[PDB]
Symmetry: C4
Subunit: 249 residues, 4 copies
Amino acid sequence: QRKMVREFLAEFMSTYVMMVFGLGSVAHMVLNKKYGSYLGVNLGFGFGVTMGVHVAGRISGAHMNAAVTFANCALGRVPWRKFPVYVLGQFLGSFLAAATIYSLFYTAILHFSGGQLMVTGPVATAGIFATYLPDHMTLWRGFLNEAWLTGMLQLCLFAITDQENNPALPGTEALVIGILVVIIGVSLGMNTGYAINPSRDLPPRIFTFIAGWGKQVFSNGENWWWVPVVAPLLGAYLGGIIYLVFIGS
Amino acid sequence: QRKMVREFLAEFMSTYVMMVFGLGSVAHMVLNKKYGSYLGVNLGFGFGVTMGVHVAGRISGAHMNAAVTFANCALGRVPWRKFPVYVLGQFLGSFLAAATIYSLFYTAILHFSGGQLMVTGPVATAGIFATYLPDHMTLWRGFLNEAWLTGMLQLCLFAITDQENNPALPGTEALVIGILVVIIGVSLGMNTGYAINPSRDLPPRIFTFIAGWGKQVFSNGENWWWVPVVAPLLGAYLGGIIYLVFIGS
Amino acid sequence: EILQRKMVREFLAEFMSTYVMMVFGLGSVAHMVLNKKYGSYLGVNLGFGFGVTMGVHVAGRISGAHMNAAVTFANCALGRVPWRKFPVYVLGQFLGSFLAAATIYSLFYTAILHFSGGQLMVTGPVATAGIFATYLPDHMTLWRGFLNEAWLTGMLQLCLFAITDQENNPALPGTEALVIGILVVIIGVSLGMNTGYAINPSRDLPPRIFTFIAGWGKQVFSNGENWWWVPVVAPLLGAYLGGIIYLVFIGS
Amino acid sequence: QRKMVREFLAEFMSTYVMMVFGLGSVAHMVLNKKYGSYLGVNLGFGFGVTMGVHVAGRISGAHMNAAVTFANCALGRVPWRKFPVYVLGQFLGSFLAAATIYSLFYTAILHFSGGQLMVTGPVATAGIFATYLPDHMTLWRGFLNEAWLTGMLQLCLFAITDQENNPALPGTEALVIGILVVIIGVSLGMNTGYAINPSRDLPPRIFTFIAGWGKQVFSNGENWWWVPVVAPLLGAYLGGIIYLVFIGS
């Protein structure tokens, strides 16, 4: 054994239940669209990220990300090298979860996706795990659409915890934290997905690149895999700072 | 009227009042589709779970069916001689709540079907009450989808009820568990619906068979009246051991 | 130059606790059966539920917040309240909802007229009246029209009493409200299809008496061979039947 | 940097979080309609209060919607000389909010606008920043309606923040105050697009008239910009008092 691995069971049974609701509900929309809604996803992710703090041990490991894994080193909260263990350790909850929703849904896309795992197009099923920015954007703006989609994932997250500026109640912190996430999938989720953490961009993207979809998950758009893995990083520490501007300093 | 009948009558009404918030939920989602929409039953049976959760002996037996009452008899809880009394007491209701979602939709299908109580095609009134698998799938994996739909609500039913590992609060349960059944239906409802408990599946499939439709309500998945009666009991043991091998042993 | 403390300071706060429910609920029915693009069915499923959770933060949190001329008749025969001061909960916040209808109407004076010609249409594909009162969408006679409103009433209380029986796992002292309209939210995804949920004799005698006054005519009280008396006698014999199915489980 | 002036920051943010959850959530039903929805406006708005709420000085420095601030001023629950501060410093939480949701969608807009800024017609844009009255609207309703939209905002606000008469618990505020405005959303925006607090109109309107839309943003409604700057001020002065008679006192 213990002393850092009772927690990596929670860090995993938290991210292995995030991507089942947040990233495993988009196949509820992009496969029937009259059984599933673009709401079923943006609402899936938040009110499923409730189960994801109901588990992780109250402050001692609940991140599920590498955008907020990284940031919680800006200041002396959780010094630097508790962090790299959670990045790779909590890709697994998103990789071998990305299967625990890929393997249970074969019969569904095999009558929707023909017999061919096409990456892009009119029966494309490669969106379900990765993040692809549609016709009307660039990376001039796709960097600033994850370093601001995660910059306020921090301002809005430091204001639901710090027991100084009057946040949530004791157990009434998951409902709001998931409700925090409903209203970004439904506000700025019309843009570079809302792959807002470097653990929905890559960890199920290196799960798509493995099952047989092709190299079009690492290249569709000049080179994408990197910005939802590099923008949340110097987006998070830059968003909770501009927050911490007003109370600290 | 003694101690242990004040245990069905308590678990009888949460298998007659979750079900009337979940059966008409579909018998309204798809029976009309204009007044009744695509969530329809995500938040109908979902939050119709919240109701019930506030209607049982506080947190000392509030299971609502014959499916989670079985994980909590082998994993140490509620000795087995208190397992089937609750199951049936519950089950004893699932029939008593459909047979009254009939007279509530009496002339809501006779102006819809004709006078024949059809189950498939242009007239579709037996996919509401029970479930019935779709045309894209066999039982090869609609069982694996029902020992995973009834084998992963236990990681949430533990992170919210168990009090050591930081949960929702005493009023805060129904709304973080009924808000699960909506978050369960926003991902994994596109497979078998969710027929997650054998107290929701059999007594309303025993009703579609006694109302006048006949034995075809069973002969639907060519045999589906045990796949969500043996996959759901075999997820509650397979999951309840995931959180307790995660934390415990 | 006189006293105004009494129960008339319940009356007054049943007034809003109703009035604020309606301008939320009624206000939303317009918002689908008048725009259909900026509005939906679901909007009333929950905009009526959280119209009632803002009814609650307007009346004593449990003692004064019925806002429903019937829950005021259910908690009288069981006994949680005396009788002779049952009027001034109906005749308060039921002429508290009548006068919320004329405040959703003259709030929509333009917004409707372009939707229904220049006609005060009761029945058709230009129907309006359904904003204020309810009508049975021809799916039924009264045989099911009284049996969807005294079981829809006795599916209410058993979910009311359970969150306010501070004995048997209710909400907190401060989350009663978020639930009890999210009762009404769900009433509109399981049961909200045939007669709607006109459970509330303050949403169905008061507003119907409004429309008939601003000119919808003597057709508001006929649609159903006469549909008015039902949700005014359908809830009272289904609240009394509604909350004795609970106290025959834990009471006496 | 630590006095009354560490409070524009409390409501720069609390207002900066009010626009950008909305202006981007109203530019989200309006720009794809298949990866978005209207509810997204009213609950991406209401729960974007929620986050507005948990940002500012606990309950008496967290308004953000400066027509409240007018009436929470004039009824004596604020020093009359600390009115302009909470506005203009939250009024800038609305400028530098529009400029910063016009940006995130810069690439998404011009693609379906070809290179030009239209205020009316079939390429309506600035309906998301400012507001404009429909086919079915005059200024008869143009004003009598924003006195009950800045009206009902109050009785339902005050009934929650005056902790005499059944309010929410001190964590339940922002969930059930944000959950208000989602109820004003699906009740009362199909007459005006509820501007309720002139915070929400005049600054991004002043933004969109600088943003090159030219003077049509002050035209439609013959002159529509003035009302949700004025009906709110002497429309929440009435949502206040009508409370303090019937309730309170």
